[PDB]
Design an enzyme around this catalytic site. Sequence first.
Site, PDB file in Angstrom:
ATOM      1  N   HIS A  27       0.845  -1.209   0.000  1.00  0.00           N
ATOM      2  CA  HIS A  27       0.000   0.000   0.000  1.00  0.00           C
ATOM      3  C   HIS A  27       0.870   1.245   0.000  1.00  0.00           C
ATOM      4  CE1 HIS A  27       0.382   0.217   4.523  1.00  0.00           C
ATOM      5  NE2 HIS A  27       0.272   1.512   4.285  1.00  0.00           N
ATOM      6  N   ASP A  36      -0.539  -7.459   1.761  1.00  0.00           N
ATOM      7  CA  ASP A  36       0.082  -6.134   1.795  1.00  0.00           C
ATOM      8  C   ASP A  36       1.592  -6.288   1.944  1.00  0.00           C
ATOM      9  OD1 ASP A  36       0.400  -3.407   1.750  1.00  0.00           O
ATOM     10  OD2 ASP A  36      -0.346  -3.064   3.797  1.00  0.00           O
ATOM     11  N   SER A  51       3.826   2.788   8.482  1.00  0.00           N
ATOM     12  CA  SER A  51       3.396   1.650   7.682  1.00  0.00           C
ATOM     13  C   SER A  51       4.457   1.332   6.619  1.00  0.00           C
ATOM     14  CB  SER A  51       1.957   1.803   7.156  1.00  0.00           C
ATOM     15  OG  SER A  51       1.818   2.828   6.199  1.00  0.00           O
ATOM     16  N   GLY A  52       4.634   0.036   6.383  1.00  0.00           N
ATOM     17  CA  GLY A  52       5.698  -0.538   5.569  1.00  0.00           C
ATOM     18  C   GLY A  52       6.917  -0.930   6.354  1.00  0.00           C
TER      19      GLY A  52
HETATM   20  C1  LIG Z   1      -9.764  -1.131   5.723  1.00  0.00           C
HETATM   21  N1  LIG Z   1      -8.419  -0.814   5.237  1.00  0.00           N
HETATM   22  C2  LIG Z   1      -8.536  -0.457   3.807  1.00  0.00           C
HETATM   23  C3  LIG Z   1      -7.568  -2.003   5.436  1.00  0.00           C
HETATM   24  C4  LIG Z   1      -7.960   0.336   6.034  1.00  0.00           C
HETATM   25  C5  LIG Z   1      -6.636   0.938   5.592  1.00  0.00           C
HETATM   26  C6  LIG Z   1      -6.371   2.307   6.231  1.00  0.00           C
HETATM   27  N2  LIG Z   1      -4.955   2.483   5.913  1.00  0.00           N
HETATM   28  C7  LIG Z   1      -4.592   3.400   4.920  1.00  0.00           C
HETATM   29  O1  LIG Z   1      -5.363   3.789   4.043  1.00  0.00           O
HETATM   30  C8  LIG Z   1      -3.173   3.836   5.114  1.00  0.00           C
HETATM   31  C9  LIG Z   1      -2.724   3.254   6.453  1.00  0.00           C
HETATM   32  C10 LIG Z   1      -4.010   2.641   6.967  1.00  0.00           C
HETATM   33  O2  LIG Z   1      -4.239   2.261   8.103  1.00  0.00           O
HETATM   34  C11 LIG Z   1      -2.127   4.430   7.223  1.00  0.00           C
HETATM   35  C12 LIG Z   1      -2.286   4.257   8.691  1.00  0.00           C
HETATM   36  N3  LIG Z   1      -3.002   4.908   9.556  1.00  0.00           N
HETATM   37  C13 LIG Z   1      -2.836   4.265  10.792  1.00  0.00           C
HETATM   38  C14 LIG Z   1      -1.954   3.273  10.581  1.00  0.00           C
HETATM   39  C15 LIG Z   1      -1.516   2.280  11.495  1.00  0.00           C
HETATM   40  C16 LIG Z   1      -1.855   2.186  12.857  1.00  0.00           C
HETATM   41  C17 LIG Z   1      -1.341   1.017  13.459  1.00  0.00           C
HETATM   42  C18 LIG Z   1      -0.639   0.294  12.530  1.00  0.00           C
HETATM   43 CL1  LIG Z   1       0.157  -1.300  12.803  1.00  0.00          CL
HETATM   44  S1  LIG Z   1      -0.574   0.944  10.954  1.00  0.00           S
HETATM   45  O3  LIG Z   1      -1.635   3.184   9.250  1.00  0.00           O
HETATM   46  N4  LIG Z   1      -2.857   5.598   6.706  1.00  0.00           N
HETATM   47  C19 LIG Z   1      -2.081   6.852   6.763  1.00  0.00           C
HETATM   48  C20 LIG Z   1      -1.480   7.094   5.379  1.00  0.00           C
HETATM   49  C21 LIG Z   1      -2.050   6.022   4.460  1.00  0.00           C
HETATM   50  C22 LIG Z   1      -3.138   5.341   5.281  1.00  0.00           C
END
Ligand SMILES: C[N+](C)(C)CCCN1C(=O)[C@@H]2[C@H](C1=O)[C@H](c1ncc(-c3ccc(Cl)s3)o1)N1CCC[C@@H]21
Lengths: 233, 54
Positions: A42, A88, A185-186
């Site tokens: 992602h 992912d 993330s990543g």
């Molecule tokens: C239902 N899903 C499509 C899987 C939800 C995905 C939501 N997701 C994003 O879209 C990414 C990622 C995330 O959680 C990321 C994010 N927010 C919180 C976190 C994490 C919190 C705890 C983690 Cl382990 S990873 O990652 N977001 C910030 C920038 C991109 C976007």
Amino acid sequence: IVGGQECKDGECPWQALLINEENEGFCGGTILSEFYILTAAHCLYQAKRFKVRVGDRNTEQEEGGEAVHEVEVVIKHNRFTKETYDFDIAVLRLKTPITFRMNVAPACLPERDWAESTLMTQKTGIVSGFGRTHEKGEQSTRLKMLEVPYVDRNSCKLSSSFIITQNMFCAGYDTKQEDACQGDSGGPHVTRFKDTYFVTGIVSWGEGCARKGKYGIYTKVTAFLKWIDRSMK
Amino acid sequence: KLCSLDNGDCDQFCHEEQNSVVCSCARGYTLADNGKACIPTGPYPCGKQTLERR
Ligand SMILES: C[N+](C)(C)CCCN1C(=O)[C@@H]2[C@H](C1=O)[C@H](c1ncc(-c3ccc(Cl)s3)o1)N1CCC[C@@H]21
Ligand code: NA
Ligand code: NA
């Protein structure tokens, strides 16, 4: 990273940072070898173009050990789905090889069956990154780490508004305010075994950061150890 | 002898045979003569913190 602590010198040497058109970090990665970085699929949609920095602990200071590498090939999992974040995972091959040195070293890839019986059954793993220090906050200029408990799958599924596939696992805390966050993330989730750190997860997603009743969701690297090996040739 | 008790005395990977255990190591390490320890082949083996400033 919400809570946790700053990584000490030499203690998170497998951390990589993906940097966008600006040299701003937006995602992490894990150094696997001189040519390969592990990251989340992602992350590949979060910037039009990006490079990889290694050896950095403080993004506002030039220590002298930092290096930036361009990406030669992106190897994205062919079942990655934006809808659910299933599969992912991605590997990046760099155009030029990393020189290992202070704060720059690979994490180990474990054997699958032993990882399942021995690593995934540990109390905790460690997550790291330069991400936000609270959900609505700003990114840390210093690299942080955090010990995160493994969370059982049943509890994981009940807690989540979205599907948790068998390519995912939960880690972190129900109510304690410690978690990964946006910008992490990543990045690496590693598990220690007799002073050696093995790759166990990739920071994948969360419903916010450190929310009560929610956990951090990680790509289950055991499911992809063969895929990683093939991807690295 | 079993991998479920002290990881079969292995430093890294352990697998059970009919009667015995067999230890092994990640790339960048060689299994020691004692069949248990994992010896780095270079200065920056995988999974080690870089604490000895060379
Ligand atoms: C239902 N899903 C499509 C899987 C939800 C995905 C939501 N997701 C994003 O879209 C990414 C990622 C995330 O959680 C990321 C994010 N927010 C919180 C976190 C994490 C919190 C705890 C983690 Cl382990 S990873 O990652 N977001 C910030 C920038 C991109 C976007
Ligand atoms: Na720096
Ligand atoms: Na929580």
